[PDB]
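Batch manifest line 1246
LIGAND: menaquinone-9
JOB: complex structure
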Amino acid sequence: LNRPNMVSVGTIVWLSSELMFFAGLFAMYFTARAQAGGAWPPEPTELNLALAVPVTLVLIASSFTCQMGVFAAERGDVFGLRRWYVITFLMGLFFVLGQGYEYIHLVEHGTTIPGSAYGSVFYLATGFHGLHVIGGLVAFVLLLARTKMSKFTPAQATAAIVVSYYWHFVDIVWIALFATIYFVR
Amino acid sequence: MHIEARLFEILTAFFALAAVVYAVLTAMFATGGVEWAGTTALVLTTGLTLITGTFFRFVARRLDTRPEDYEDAEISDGAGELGFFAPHSWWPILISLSFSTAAVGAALWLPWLIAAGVAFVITSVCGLVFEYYWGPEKH
Amino acid sequence: SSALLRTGKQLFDTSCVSCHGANLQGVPDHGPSLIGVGEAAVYFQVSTGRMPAMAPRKDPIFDEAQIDAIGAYVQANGGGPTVVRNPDGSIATQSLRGNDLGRGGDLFRLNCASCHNFTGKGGALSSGKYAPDLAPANEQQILTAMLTGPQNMPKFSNRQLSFEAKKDIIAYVKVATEARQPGGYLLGGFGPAPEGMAMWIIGMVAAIGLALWIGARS
Amino acid sequence: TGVDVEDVPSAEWGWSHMPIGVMHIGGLLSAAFLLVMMRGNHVGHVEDWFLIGFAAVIVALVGRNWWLRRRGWIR
Amino acid sequence: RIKPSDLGRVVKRKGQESFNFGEFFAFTKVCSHLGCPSSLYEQQSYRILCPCHQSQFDALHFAKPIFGPAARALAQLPITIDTDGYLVANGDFVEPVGPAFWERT
Amino acid sequence: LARQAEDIDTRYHPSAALRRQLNKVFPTHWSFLLGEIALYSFVVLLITGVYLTLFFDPSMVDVTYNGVYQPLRGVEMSRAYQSALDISFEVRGGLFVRQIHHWAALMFAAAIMVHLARIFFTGAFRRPRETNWVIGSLLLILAMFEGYFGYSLPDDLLSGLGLRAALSSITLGMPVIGTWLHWALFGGDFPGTILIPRLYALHILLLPGIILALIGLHLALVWFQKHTQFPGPGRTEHNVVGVRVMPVFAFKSGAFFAAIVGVLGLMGGLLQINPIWNLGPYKPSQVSAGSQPDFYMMWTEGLARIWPPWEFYFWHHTIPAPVWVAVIMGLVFVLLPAYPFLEKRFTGDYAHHNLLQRPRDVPVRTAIGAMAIAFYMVLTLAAMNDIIALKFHISLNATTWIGRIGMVILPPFVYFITYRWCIGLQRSDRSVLEHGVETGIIKRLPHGAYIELHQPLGPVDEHGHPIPLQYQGAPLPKRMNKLGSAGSPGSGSFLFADSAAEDAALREAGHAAEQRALAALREH
Ligand SMILES: CC(C)=CCC/C(C)=C/CC/C(C)=C\CC/C(C)=C/CC/C(C)=C/CC/C(C)=C/CC/C(C)=C\CC/C(C)=C\CC/C(C)=C/CC1=C(C)C(=O)c2ccccc2C1=O
Ligand code: HEC
Ligand code: HEC
Ligand code: HEM
Ligand SMILES: COc1ccn2nc(C)c(C(=O)NCc3ccc(N4CCC(c5ccc(OC(F)(F)F)cc5)CC4)cc3)c2c1
Ligand code: FES
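JOB STATUS: finished
ARTIFACT:
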C-alpha cells in the first residue's frame, strides 16, 4: 500500500517554499546593486577569495558523502549510514567554522551591518544560509540518535533519504549564492 | 500519478513565459532598465513549480498503475493495510509555546529570552521526533 | 562663518514648524515654546534621536554639522545653556572624567540611582514613563542630559551641581557601564529576580533530570 | 460524601465531591470583594469599570447555574 | 521649586497655608507607609513616587496620596530665609514623620 | 580485616542491628529523591558557612574603607560591609565560596517547595504521618526566616531597605504591643548598634541548631515508619517492594550527592549572585529602583504591594495598612500545618494508608493545590512590577491593577480547569482499559471500511474483542513502543558491527531475564 512515499512529497513541496524564501532575499540583493554606481563594493570592502573556494569544495564533498550514506541506507545496515553521516556532520561543521572565521576577519577592519548597504545585503544573504546549514546539522544529529534506539525499519530509511536531499538543496542554493556574490559582483 | 505532473508542467510553462516577457519588456520601455525585483520572484516561482513537476514526473515514470489513478476499479482493490497515523499527542502545543517565546523575545530585543526560546524549541522538537521510538525503561 | 544660521532656519522650517511654530512659539496643541532653551537642549534632543517626534530614543536624522545649525539658530532666540567645546571647536569628551570615582559614585547614589539603578540600568516610573539605560550614551550626552533636564527628569543647574561634580558623575557612569563582572555572568544587573529564575530553570531542572535518570519510575 | 461513578470514574479512590453551596457563596463573596475595592486613591475611573465588568460576569454565571439547578436542567 | 507658570493649582492644606516661601515647598522624604525614601520626583506631573511599593503623592495637593497602599499625606516643613539670604527652617513639623503606630501618626 | 572486625565484634557485638539495617528495603521512584536534594543542599550550606565564619566581623561601627577596591576608597561604611568586601576581594577563593553559599540557599528553598508539592499531591500525609507533615511545615518556616536573616548580614543598601521596611515598619505597626516589640528587638529606634550582632548570633547558632534537630527527627520518623509506595503489580498495604540498602541504595544516594554538589559548584562559579560592591553601604537617605527580596519572600512583598489602603482611625489611635499583611501571613502559616486534620474532618476518613494516590484520582484536592499554586504565582509576579513594566512595555498602574484583580479571578478559573482536566485523564484511562492500546495502523477491509488495529492487554473473547479489565490504581501504557514492540537495534559500538553470535546470545539472554523478572514479581 501507498506506492509513492508520503514523507518524500511533503519534503519536496516544503523545499519549494524555501526556494521562494531565498528568492525574496535575492530580490533584496539585486536592488541596491543597480543604485551603487562604480566600485559598488565600497573601498573598505574586498572579498578574500583565498578562503571561499576551499569551503565550497568542502560543502560539495559533503553532498557526495551524504549520497553515499543514502546508498548504504537503502540496504538495511545501520553502521555504514552512521559512518557516512558522521563524516557529513564533520564537514558541515568545518564549513560553518570557516564562514564564521571569514565574518570575523571581515568585520575586523571595515564592513558592518549598520555601516553600509553592501554589508547589509551581504550579511543578510549569507547569514540565513548559515542558519539553514545549522538546522541541517541538528537534523543529522537527531537522525543518528534515533537510529541508535531501535531496530532498522523502512521508516528510518525514508527519514535518512529526506534529510539527505534537504542537505542537497542547501548546498545547491549555496552554489547559487557563491557564483552570484564572489564572481559576478 | 499522471495528472498532477501535467498540472505542474502547465503552471511552470506559463510562469516561465511570463518571467521572460516581463524581463525583456522592462529591459526597454522602462525608466531605469530591468526592474530586478519582480523578475527574480518570477524566475524562482518558475523554479518552484519546475522542481515539484519534475519530481512528480519521475515518480510517475517509475510506478505501475494505482487504484486511485485507475478508473474501472472496485473497492476490493484497495483492501489492505495503510500506514501509521499518529493518535493523541501533546507535543505540538509545547513546540508552539516555545516558538512564541522566541518570537516575543525577538520582538522586544531581549537576548536571554531568545536563547531560552531556542533551547526550548530544540527540546520540544526532540521530544516530538523521538515520541514513538523510545524503548521500555531499563531499570 | 558663524554669521550663517540661514541653514538651521532652513531645516527647522521643514521639520519642526508643525509642532513648535514658525517663530519657536509653542503651538498650543503639541509642543513647548523652545525660547528659553539653548544649544544644549537641542543637542541632547536631536543627537540621541528623541527629536523630530511622531518619546523614545530612536535613530538620529541630522548630522554633517546641522545639529550645530539648529543649535545655533535656537540659541540666537534665547539664552539657554550651551554645549561644551574643546580647544578645536568640536565637543570635547574624556577630560570631563574626574580623577575621582568615589565622590562621583556617592553623588550618583544620592541623586541619580533612585530612578535609574545602582549601576545605571533602567527603572520604571508611573503610568507609562520609565527611566532608560545609561550604557550607550556618551559623555557630552550625559552632561547635557543632567544640565537641561529632559521630560520628567529633574534639572541640575551648574549652581547646585558644579562642573567638577558633573565630570565626576560622568566618569563614574562611564566606568560602571564598561567594567567586567568578576564573579561570572551577571544576570542583567538587577537583584534577585533573575537569580531566582536562573535557579528554577537551570539548577532545579538539572537536579530533577538526574533524579529521573538515577531513580526508576513506576 | 458521595458521587455516582458514571460522572467521576475514580469516585471510590479519593475525594471527588465539593458541595455547590461553597461555590455559589464563594462567587458572591468574590464579587462583593471586587466591588468594595473602589475605596481608595484611584483618581481616574478606567479601573473602576473593569471592577464593575468583572463583578457582573461572576454574578451572571452564579445566577445562571443556580437557576438551571433550581429547574432540574442540571443534576 | 515649582514653576511660576502653575502656582495656581496649589491647594494648601488647612493648617499649613504659610509653610512655603514663594515657590519652595520642602516636604519630608520618609514615605508615610513604611518609611522608604520617596525620592522619585517627576518634574512636570508633580508626582512623588516611592520605589519600595510604588505609592504616588501629589506635590501640588499638599502631598496627598493618589495611588497604592499609602493613606496619609507627607509632612510639610516651614521654611524662610534669614538676614543674610540663606534658607532656614521656620519651626518644626506639625505632626510625627514616618510610618504610623498605635498612639498616633 | 579479620582481626579488627572480630575484636570490634567481641567488644560491641552489633552483628544483628547491622544486619537489620543492611536488609532494609527502599522503594525506587524518581519522585523520592526531592528530599535528598534538600538534605544535600543543607550539608553544603553548613560546610560553606563554617568556612565563612572565619573572616566575617559583625559590627555596626563606622570606618573609612582604604582597601583595594578603588571606586569605594574614602567612603565611610560599617565594619560588616568592609568585612564582606574583604572576603570578596582579598581572600583567595572567597567570592567563589560566598557565591556557592547563596546558590545553595536558593536551591535549599526550591527543593523544599518541590518536595512539599509532591507530599501534598500524592497524599502521603494521611493517618500515620500527620506529625511528620507538621515537622516539615515548621522546617519550611524556619528555612524562610533563616535565609532572610542570612542575606541581611552584610549591610548594604538593598539589605538595609529590606530590613527597614519589612522588619522595622511592620513590627512597629502591630495594634497594641507594636513599638514594645520593636524596642525589644532593635534595642531602640531602627538604626541601632545591636542589630547586626544579634542577627549574626541568630543566623549561625540558633536557627541552624533548631533546623538540625528537626531534620534529625524528620529522618528518624521516616526511617521507623517505613516509606510509602505507589500501587502496582506486587504492591500491597503490608509490604515494601524495592531494593535493599546494602549494595544499591547507598550507592545511588552517594552518586546523587556528588552530582548535586557538582551542579552547585558549576553554577556558583559561572553565574554571579549578590554583587554587593556595585551597591553601597546602607545610608537612610538614598535608595534604588529594584528593591526585591529573594524569591521566597517575594510573595510577602507582592501581598504588601497589591493590598488596598484600608486603615482605621478611632479615638486617639491608628491601625495602619500593613497589619493586614501581618494577619494574612499568619493565617497562611497557620493554615499550612493544620491541613490534614481539616481534610480528615471534612471527608471523614480515618484509616491507615500506605499506598499513594495518583493526583488524577483525587480531583478536588488536586484542584485545591493548583488554585493555591496559582495564587502563589500571582503574588510572586506582582513583586517584580518594575522589572516587568520596564522590560516588557506595560504601564505600572496597569500591572498593579492586573495583580489586584488576578488575585481574585485566577484561582477559581484554575480550580475549574484542573477539576475538568483530572476527570478527562480518568476517562482516557478507562477507554484504554475497555479497548486495547491504539497502534495507529489503518486497514481498509475490502468493503471499504477503516479500522485501527487495537492491541489487547489481557484475554480475548470468542470473536476477537478483548474482555474489559478493572482499574487498579496503576498507570497504563499508551504508546506501542513502550511495550516491547519495535526494539533490538544492532549490537555494534557506534560504527562497527559485532559478530552475529554475540548479538543473538546477548539479545536472547536479555529477553529471558526480562521475562523472568516479570514472572517472578507477578507470582508473589
Ligand atoms: C501545594 C500547596 C501549596 C499546598 C496547599 C496547602 C494549604 C492550602 C496551604 C494554604 C496556602 C495558601 C492559602 C496560600 C499559598 C501561598 C503561600 C502558602 C506561599 C508559601 C510558600 C509555599 C507554600 C510554596 C507553594 C508550593 C510551591 C509554589 C510549588 C511550586 C513548584 C512546583 C509545583 C513545580 C516546579 C517545577 C519546576 C522544575 C519548573 C518550573 C519553572 C519555573 C517557571 C517555575 C515558576 C517560578 C516559580 C515557582 C518561582 O517561585 C519563581 C520565583 C522567582 C522568579 C521566577 C519564578 C518562577 O518562574
Ligand atoms: C509635534 C512633533 C514634534 C516635532 C516634529 C519636533 N518636536 Fe521637539 N518636542 C515635541 C514635544 C511634544 C516636546 C516636549 C518634550 C517631551 O515631552 O518629551 C518637544 C521638545 C523639544 C525640545 C526640548 C524642550 C525643553 O523644554 O527641553 C527641543 C529642544 C525640541 N523639541 C526641538 C526640536 C527639534 C530640534 C526638532 C527637529 C527640527 C523638533 N523639536 C521637532 C514635539 C515635536
Ligand atoms: C526618575 C527621575 C530621574 C532622575 C532623578 C534622574 N533621571 Fe535621568 N532620566 C530620567 C528620565 C525619565 C529620562 C528620559 C528622558 C527622555 O527620554 O527624554 C532620563 C534620561 C537620562 C539620560 C539619557 C539616557 C540615554 O540613553 O539617552 C541620561 C544620560 C540621564 N538621564 C542621566 C541622569 C543622571 C546622571 C542623573 C543623576 C544626576 C539622572 N539621570 C537622574 C529620569 C531621571
Ligand atoms: C541553614 C540554612 C542557611 C541559609 C538559608 C543561609 C543563607 C545565607 C545567605 C543567603 C547569606 C548571604 C551570603 C551573601 O550574600 O554573601 C548568608 C550569609 C552568611 N552565612 Fe548563611 N545560611 C545558612 C546557614 C549557615 C550556617 C550553618 C553558617 C555557619 C555555620 C552560615 C554562615 C554565614 C555567614 C558567616 C554569613 C555572612 C558572610 C557573608 O555574608 O559573606 N550560614 N547565609
Ligand atoms: C530587600 O529589599 C526590599 C524592598 C522592599 N521590601 N518590602 C518588603 C515587605 C520587603 C521584605 O523583605 N519582606 C519580607 C518580610 C516581610 C515581613 C516580615 N515580618 C517579620 C516581623 C514581623 C512581625 C509582626 C508582628 C509580630 O507580632 C508577634 F510577635 F508575632 F506577635 C511579630 C513579628 C512579622 C512580619 C519579615 C520579612 C522588602 C525588601
Ligand atoms: S515604603 Fe514608600 S510605598 Fe511602602
